[PDB]
Amino acid sequence: EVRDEVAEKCQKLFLDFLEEFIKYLQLAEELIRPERNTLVVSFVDLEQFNQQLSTTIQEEFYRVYPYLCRALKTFVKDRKEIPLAKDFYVAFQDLPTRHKIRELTSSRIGLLTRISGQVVRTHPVHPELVSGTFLCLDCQTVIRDVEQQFKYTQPNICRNPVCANRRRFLLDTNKSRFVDFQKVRIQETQAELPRGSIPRSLEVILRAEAVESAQAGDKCDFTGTLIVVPDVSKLSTPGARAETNSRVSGVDGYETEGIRGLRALGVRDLSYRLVFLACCVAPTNPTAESIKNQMTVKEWEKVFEMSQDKNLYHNLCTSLFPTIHGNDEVKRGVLLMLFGGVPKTTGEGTSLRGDINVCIVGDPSTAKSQFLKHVEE
Amino acid sequence: AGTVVLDDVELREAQRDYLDFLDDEEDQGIYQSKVRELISDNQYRLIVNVNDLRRKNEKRANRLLNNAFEELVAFQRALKDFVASIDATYAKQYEEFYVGLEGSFGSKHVSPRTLTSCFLSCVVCVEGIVTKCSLVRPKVVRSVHYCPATKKTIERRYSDLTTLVAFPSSSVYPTKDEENNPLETEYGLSVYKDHQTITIQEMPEKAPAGQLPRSVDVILDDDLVDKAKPGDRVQVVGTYRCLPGKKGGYTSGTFRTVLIACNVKQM
Amino acid sequence: KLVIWGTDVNVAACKENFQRFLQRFIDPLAKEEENVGIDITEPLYMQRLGEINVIGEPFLNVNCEHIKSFDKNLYRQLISYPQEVIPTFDMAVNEIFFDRYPDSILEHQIQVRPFNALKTKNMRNLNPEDIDQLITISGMVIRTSQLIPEMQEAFFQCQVCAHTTRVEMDRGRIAEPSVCGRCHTTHSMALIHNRSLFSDKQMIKLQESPEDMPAGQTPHTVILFAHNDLVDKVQPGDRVNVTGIYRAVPIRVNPRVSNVKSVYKTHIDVIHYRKTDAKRLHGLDEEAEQKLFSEKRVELLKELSRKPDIYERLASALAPSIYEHEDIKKGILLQLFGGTRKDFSHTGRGKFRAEINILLCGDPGTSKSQLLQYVYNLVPRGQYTSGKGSSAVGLTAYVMKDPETRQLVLQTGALVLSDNGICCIDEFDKMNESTRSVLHEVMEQQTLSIAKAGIICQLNARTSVLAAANPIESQWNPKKTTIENIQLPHTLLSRFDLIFLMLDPQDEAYDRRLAHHLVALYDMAVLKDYIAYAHSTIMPRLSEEASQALIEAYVDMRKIGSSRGMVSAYPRQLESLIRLAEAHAKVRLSNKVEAIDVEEAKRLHREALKQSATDPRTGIVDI
Amino acid sequence: CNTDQAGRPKCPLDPYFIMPDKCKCVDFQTLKLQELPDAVPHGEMPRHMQLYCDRYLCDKVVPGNRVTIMGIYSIKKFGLTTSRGRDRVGVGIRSSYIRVLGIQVDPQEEEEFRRLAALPNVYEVISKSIAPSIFGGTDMKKAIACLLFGGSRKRLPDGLTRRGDINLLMLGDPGTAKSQLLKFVEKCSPIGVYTSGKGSSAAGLTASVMRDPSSRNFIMEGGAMVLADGGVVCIDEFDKMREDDRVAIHEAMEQQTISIAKAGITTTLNSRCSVLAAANS
DNA sequence: GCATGCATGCGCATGCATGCATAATGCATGCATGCGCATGCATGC
Numbered sequence A: 001e002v003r004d005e006v007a008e009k010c011q012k013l014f015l016d017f018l019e020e021f022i023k024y025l026q027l028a029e030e031l032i033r034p035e036r037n038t039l040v041v042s043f044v045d046l047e048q049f050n051q052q053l054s055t056t057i058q059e060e061f062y063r064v065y066p067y068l069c070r071a072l073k074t075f076v077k078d079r080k081e082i083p084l085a086k087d088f089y090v091a092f093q094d095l096p097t098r099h100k101i102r103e104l105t106s107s108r109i110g111l112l113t114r115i116s117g118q119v120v121r122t123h124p125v126h127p128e129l130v131s132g133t134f135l136c137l138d139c140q141t142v143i144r145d146v147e148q149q150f151k152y153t154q155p156n157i158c159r160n161p162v163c164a165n166r167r168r169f170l171l172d173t174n175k176s177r178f179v180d181f182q183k184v185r186i187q188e189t190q191a192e193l194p195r196g197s198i199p200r201s202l203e204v205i206l207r208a209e210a211v212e213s214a215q216a217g218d219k220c221d222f223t224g225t226l227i228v229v230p231d232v233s234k235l236s237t238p239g240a241r242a243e244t245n246s247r248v249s250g251v252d253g254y255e256t257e258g259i260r261g262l263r264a265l266g267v268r269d270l271s272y273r274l275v276f277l278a279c280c281v282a283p284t285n286p287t288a289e290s291i292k293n294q295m296t297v298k299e300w301e302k303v304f305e306m307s308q309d310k311n312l313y314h315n316l317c318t319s320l321f322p323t324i325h326g327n328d329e330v331k332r333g334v335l336l337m338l339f340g341g342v343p344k345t346t347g348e349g350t351s352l353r354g355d356i357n358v359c360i361v362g363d364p365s366t367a368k369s370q371f372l373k374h375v376e377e
Numbered sequence B: 001a002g003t004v005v006l007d008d009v010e011l012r013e014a015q016r017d018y019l020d021f022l023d024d025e026e027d028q029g030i031y032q033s034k035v036r037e038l039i040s041d042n043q044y045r046l047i048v049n050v051n052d053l054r055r056k057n058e059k060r061a062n063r064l065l066n067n068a069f070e071e072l073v074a075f076q077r078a079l080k081d082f083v084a085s086i087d088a089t090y091a092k093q094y095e096e097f098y099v100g101l102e103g104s105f106g107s108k109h110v111s112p113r114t115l116t117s118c119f120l121s122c123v124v125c126v127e128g129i130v131t132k133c134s135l136v137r138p139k140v141v142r143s144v145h146y147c148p149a150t151k152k153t154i155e156r157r158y159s160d161l162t163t164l165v166a167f168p169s170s171s172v173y174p175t176k177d178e179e180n181n182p183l184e185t186e187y188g189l190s191v192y193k194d195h196q197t198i199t200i201q202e203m204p205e206k207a208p209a210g211q212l213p214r215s216v217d218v219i220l221d222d223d224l225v226d227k228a229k230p231g232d233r234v235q236v237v238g239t240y241r242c243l244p245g246k247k248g249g250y251t252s253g254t255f256r257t258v259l260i261a262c263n264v265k266q267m
Numbered sequence C: 001k002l003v004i005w006g007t008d009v010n011v012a013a014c015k016e017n018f019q020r021f022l023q024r025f026i027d028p029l030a031k032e033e034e035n036v037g038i039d040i041t042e043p044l045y046m047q048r049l050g051e052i053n054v055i056g057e058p059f060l061n062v063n064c065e066h067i068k069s070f071d072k073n074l075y076r077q078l079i080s081y082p083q084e085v086i087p088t089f090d091m092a093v094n095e096i097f098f099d100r101y102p103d104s105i106l107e108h109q110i111q112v113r114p115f116n117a118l119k120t121k122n123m124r125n126l127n128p129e130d131i132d133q134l135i136t137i138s139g140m141v142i143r144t145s146q147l148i149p150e151m152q153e154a155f156f157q158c159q160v161c162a163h164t165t166r167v168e169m170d171r172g173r174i175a176e177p178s179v180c181g182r183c184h185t186t187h188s189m190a191l192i193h194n195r196s197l198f199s200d201k202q203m204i205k206l207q208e209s210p211e212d213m214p215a216g217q218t219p220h221t222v223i224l225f226a227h228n229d230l231v232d233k234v235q236p237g238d239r240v241n242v243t244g245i246y247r248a249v250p251i252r253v254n255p256r257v258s259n260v261k262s263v264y265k266t267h268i269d270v271i272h273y274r275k276t277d278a279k280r281l282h283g284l285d286e287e288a289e290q291k292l293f294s295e296k297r298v299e300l301l302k303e304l305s306r307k308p309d310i311y312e313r314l315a316s317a318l319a320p321s322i323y324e325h326e327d328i329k330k331g332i333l334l335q336l337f338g339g340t341r342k343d344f345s346h347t348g349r350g351k352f353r354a355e356i357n358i359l360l361c362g363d364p365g366t367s368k369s370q371l372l373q374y375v376y377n378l379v380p381r382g383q384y385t386s387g388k389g390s391s392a393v394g395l396t397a398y399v400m401k402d403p404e405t406r407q408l409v410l411q412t413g414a415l416v417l418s419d420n421g422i423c424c425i426d427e428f429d430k431m432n433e434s435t436r437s438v439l440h441e442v443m444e445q446q447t448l449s450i451a452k453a454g455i456i457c458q459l460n461a462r463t464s465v466l467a468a469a470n471p472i473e474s475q476w477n478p479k480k481t482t483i484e485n486i487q488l489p490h491t492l493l494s495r496f497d498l499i500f501l502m503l504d505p506q507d508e509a510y511d512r513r514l515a516h517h518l519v520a521l522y523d524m525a526v527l528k529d530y531i532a533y534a535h536s537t538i539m540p541r542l543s544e545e546a547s548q549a550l551i552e553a554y555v556d557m558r559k560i561g562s563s564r565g566m567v568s569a570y571p572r573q574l575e576s577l578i579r580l581a582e583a584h585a586k587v588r589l590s591n592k593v594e595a596i597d598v599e600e601a602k603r604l605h606r607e608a609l610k611q612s613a614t615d616p617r618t619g620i621v622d623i
Numbered sequence D: 001c002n003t004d005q006a007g008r009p010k011c012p013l014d015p016y017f018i019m020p021d022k023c024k025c026v027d028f029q030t031l032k033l034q035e036l037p038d039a040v041p042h043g044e045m046p047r048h049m050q051l052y053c054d055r056y057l058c059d060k061v062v063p064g065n066r067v068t069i070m071g072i073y074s075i076k077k078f079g080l081t082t083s084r085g086r087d088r089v090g091v092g093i094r095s096s097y098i099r100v101l102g103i104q105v106d107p108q109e110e111e112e113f114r115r116l117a118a119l120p121n122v123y124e125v126i127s128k129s130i131a132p133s134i135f136g137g138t139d140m141k142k143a144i145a146c147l148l149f150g151g152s153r154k155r156l157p158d159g160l161t162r163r164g165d166i167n168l169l170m171l172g173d174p175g176t177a178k179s180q181l182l183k184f185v186e187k188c189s190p191i192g193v194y195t196s197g198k199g200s201s202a203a204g205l206t207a208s209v210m211r212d213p214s215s216r217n218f219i220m221e222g223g224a225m226v227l228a229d230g231g232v233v234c235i236d237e238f239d240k241m242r243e244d245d246r247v248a249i250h251e252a253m254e255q256q257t258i259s260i261a262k263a264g265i266t267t268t269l270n271s272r273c274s275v276l277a278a279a280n281s
Numbered sequence E: 001g002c003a004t005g006c007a008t009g010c011g012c013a014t015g016c017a018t019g020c021a022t023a024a025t026g027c028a029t030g031c032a033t034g035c036g037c038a039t040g041c042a043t044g045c
């Protein structure tokens, strides 16, 4: 068979990185649980460990990543007993560079990028095929391990030399391989808008554990790949297309006319669209016990310092509204509305409001919209 | 089929040429008395000298020898026209009349051993002896049926060898009415024509010594049924054509060649 | 071959011709005005190649008219058959570059880009004779789609023995191997898209601005296809020039069939972009680059700025064919300069409007409409709306779906296309309250918020407004007060920086001067350069003296405007004073605002409203 | 049926018929070839081959000829048909044959002949040339020479004919050099047949007629007399002839024709032969 | 006259009856001829 040198070297060096630089052994210890599939690795550790390896992975992310997955699988298999059915994936967080959405071009297809955006919509979760198994309907041969990529792809040809079947197959879902799947829409932020331009919209795809996060309305940074997916109704006019290299001509009664000739030569239209696959999703800027535990010691010190100050009533008024003169009553009301009350329910099935609503009526130019803008900010 | 033809220069000109050929008014021709003799004798075919035609019109003779079927059709049409002209009453009896050929064909004078595919679709002359003959059999041309349930009579026309190629839609014998009422065949009103098949062999006196003989198969139509008998030395002039095999998927590519007689002469 | 089939082009002859021309061409007419940064006494294009070697830009721009001046055969051959001519030019340039400057590092070789083909014809005048020929376009961009990746080299992998091959696209079609190269299996080769090579594509829609217009011709929309580096070089609202080839493409009957229609489609393949124009002011693209090589012009303008009357001179030079109304022209000039664009995001206040909005209220028998027309025609990124003709959804943005593709969710309106520009509104009275509701937020927050089904977004609308209005009776009735004559809500009026109450004094000197001027009706470049330099090189700032002068002006204005009948004052007038003072500081090319600027701003504010002649306790203007 | 028909209803399955009158045809023949008896291995049955002849190669070879043939070795192709018969041992065997591409069958001279014949001494030269190896018999040699040249046949206005060929008889003691002259005559004449009484090994002396029962054809078998026309027939052992041949030879010698009548057929065959016979005491 | 209500109007999605496209292989039958048999005719001695 034919092997890849770069893939082998990347496998060896990434195994060296996982074995030598150990947090990742402790995370593989957590990886035993059935709800965990992904290992999270910091990229600054890659930069420190080997600049050459980091550069190779950045310039060859798509080509190398499946082999890093196999290396991780071998590592966890050596360290612990896990059934071979389960898969495992690698993640990266701390990229030192950012790229704007419009800066994404065709030259970056397949490499590792990191962008920023705002979530607009999230679709429900579904299972998906990764590698299928098919049965030939003519000669009953079993074909296993057909890669699906990004479309429902049947086997190219029946592996029996005499059969040569390419159109009739059955799918045995029991032997197949699955992965979780979710779709999300993101939008370009306002600060990145050029003159007179509508924000750009992009589609992001989450697989397995990363599916959970990125709810609607968030403002988050993504790190992953930029990948090309085919489309159907893009070309109302003829464009680039595929064909076969065989020098085959028709015969009388079976002349290669339009439809039959196109079907005989296997002509397919080459249409494509750009899709982003995400492997790391983070907040752009980051159950009372959980909140307390999340905060560090210095943050908790600051919170406690704030807690026991009476001037908290005064200083919060001036902090949020430094420029507006007077109108301290409105500031106090807005702060009270922000903090809010406690909702309750009664035994008869009724409910009681716990929120506060505020209205401002005033003469022109009395800073009336400034409060709204400050609360929005 | 509603397809019709409006103009055809070649066929119309050939018909005009035969019309001028068989006039015999400003010439010493005899064909007028021949037609009168045919009317007197109730026969329905004519024999015309090929050399005479070549002398009067060489181009028509060349075309007729090189191409047979269309030119023969034009001859038959011209005969129908002139028989109608001289006596339209007699032309009512018969559907179409026929043409015989006579004279020295020259290069086309061909022995059963020297008949080749080069002479296909042309008129050839052959001298031989008769070896096999078959019984005379009738063939249906026009069929007539009657329905006792509805007291209606219908008629169907058949044309098999008139057209070069036949299809399954034709040659179907009707037996039931449109409402499945049985039909009764009425053999008196139908039309039949006789049919016979003979075989001709090269004469042993002419064949090269010590070599096996070669033979040709001939079909005799309604008029020439009784003109031949086995063990007889004859000369046959007629078309040389291929035989259409019945429907199939795979064909070997070998046809059967059969000579269709137009003139049979006892030398 | 001596000639190419269907043409008369010779490859070697054209190569030698171009190589010689790159060294021989000299033009005396092109002075330092456009031969910028180049020694004129030397050949021009060789100096351009040397500058390319200095910078390393892999692209060279060539004017067609220079080539035509050198010879006509080369010009005609370049126009007629660009495909057979340009690739020769690429290698002709590359050989010279590598010979004269060996071992200079570049990522790829040089590509040549022609520009400025002389065609002043209406696009509807194009004919089939001109298919596949080089043409020029002057227009404005309104729609730009997303980038499309199009394949150039496919990658195949053997499913049986992992053998991999690459196939280069030829004639627009890819032929995948039907047999492997190491196991000889048939149809074992599969295509992998992500391993392939792709290129960028973009579709642009442009609105025509023809010089010659027949009778009764509707506006036109042109489809352009831009590839590689030309992507994202233009934005909606920009007025540009384009050089490219004219094409024709067949159209499918329906997407599911391969049949094509007989009537062809058409489009234009862009090759070159240009921003310079000899009638309108410079855009923001050129201002953000150090292209002020004309040190002579810099010195001349800096010496002019020190002269005292230059201000008035600018007010004189803004419009030669317009009458004695110098205050209006001064206000328009201060609008052109604009206030300083400070950053207040750290404060949390939000955006602060740094531009100038002006209102002109008067009878229809005046010249406000001509002023609006002149400002529209003078400044790039200008828009013009009139009365009820526009709707609330017509401005801002509206929901659409592509007639060519599946969807284009949102499309910009009049106001957004005017971003960083000027919008001129006429017949402001007839506009309904629905559109004024939009104007309320646009005129202050500089942003728009849109929330509809599946569409929540915020847009930038940093425009400057020139509004025209009429009295309710179409006459300035002196018995009614100013507020009663105007009949607009005070919230809308307060946001205008300057209000000009056009009135007819019926002075004999005015009549004589205007009659003489109107009957007699029977340096622009210097002004352009000065305006661009001032607008792009100086940030005004003010000291405590200006601060106290502004505060005194504010309290005096509040004292004067307290009386009913006249337009009352509000705190936004203080910010208007600040903006006018900063604009006046920009006029003098001064980074420091002096008390002179504040006093001039106060003078303009007082004179625009005619508060001096107006009776303070009755609200009636007198003479 | 490869026609674009939208809105129209479509043609059925298998709608095609062969038109016979619109085809191009060529000649076709098959031949059977046997291994040469000169090269067949001792004690082994000879092998056979089938040959294909097209267009102008037809009728260039008569059965019995010794031929050299250049061709292409091929197999028949009539589809993947199933094996037939009660024997199905052979698997994947296609009948083979040879496609024939070439066939070979195993006036200054006039000036020389005209120059020779004008001499007055040609008689002596010819007489000497006739078997010079044989001693004596100059008169016999001259008689043989004038036999070889032969007389002239004459048809007459009445339809009667008169023989134009010469008949000779040689009676003698054994060992008088008679057979050698007959063999020399057989070789010298352009056409010549040498036979004895009762015919030959597998060929009769006179023709016979039969009827093929399967396919009704009147077959005639060439005899030693019919096979020669204008040639010379040398006949040894004139005494051993059978009765039927003895009766037929009377007509064959006199009128140069043979008459045979059978059921449904009457034929007259030509036999224009000169006769040169030898006999014993 | 200006503010509000609202019957009309338009474009793209899915659901459902009709309508459209596909497409060689295996088995049976009559013609040619070998092989065993009995009758009968013709030919010798």
Ligand SMILES: Nc1ncnc2c1ncn2[C@@H]1O[C@H](COP(=O)(O)OP(=O)(O)O)[C@@H](O)[C@H]1O
Pocket (backbone or CB within 6 Å): A323, A324, A325, A326, A363, A364, A365, A366, A367, A368, A369, A370, C444, C571, C572
């Ligand atoms: N009390 C105040 N303190 C500071 N700035 C003020 C005050 N009142 C008004 N302003 C200024 O005046 C402007 C008021 O406009 P805005 O608040 O939009 O009016 P409205 O909200 O009534 O339409 C603001 O830009 C603000 O900077």
Ligand SMILES: Nc1ncnc2c1ncn2[C@@H]1O[C@H](COP(=O)(O)OP(=O)(O)O)[C@@H](O)[C@H]1O
Pocket (backbone or CB within 6 Å): D133, D134, D135, D136, D173, D174, D175, D176, D177, D178, D179, D180
């Ligand atoms: N005069 C002669 N010259 C040469 N050879 C002779 C002569 N007489 C006899 N022979 C030889 O004797 C043999 C005679 O045998 P053959 O001619 O068969 O006798 P017959 O013809 O009587 O049967 C021949 O082979 C021949 O070579």
Ligand SMILES: [Mg+2]
Pocket (backbone or CB within 6 Å): A368, A369
């Ligand atoms: Mg407000």
Ligand SMILES: [Zn+2]
Pocket (backbone or CB within 6 Å): A136, A137, A138, A139, A140, A141, A158, A159, A160, A163, A164, A165
């Ligand atoms: Zn199979």
Ligand SMILES: [Zn+2]
Pocket (backbone or CB within 6 Å): C158, C159, C160, C161, C162, C163, C180, C181, C182, C183, C184, C185, C188
């Ligand atoms: Zn392979």
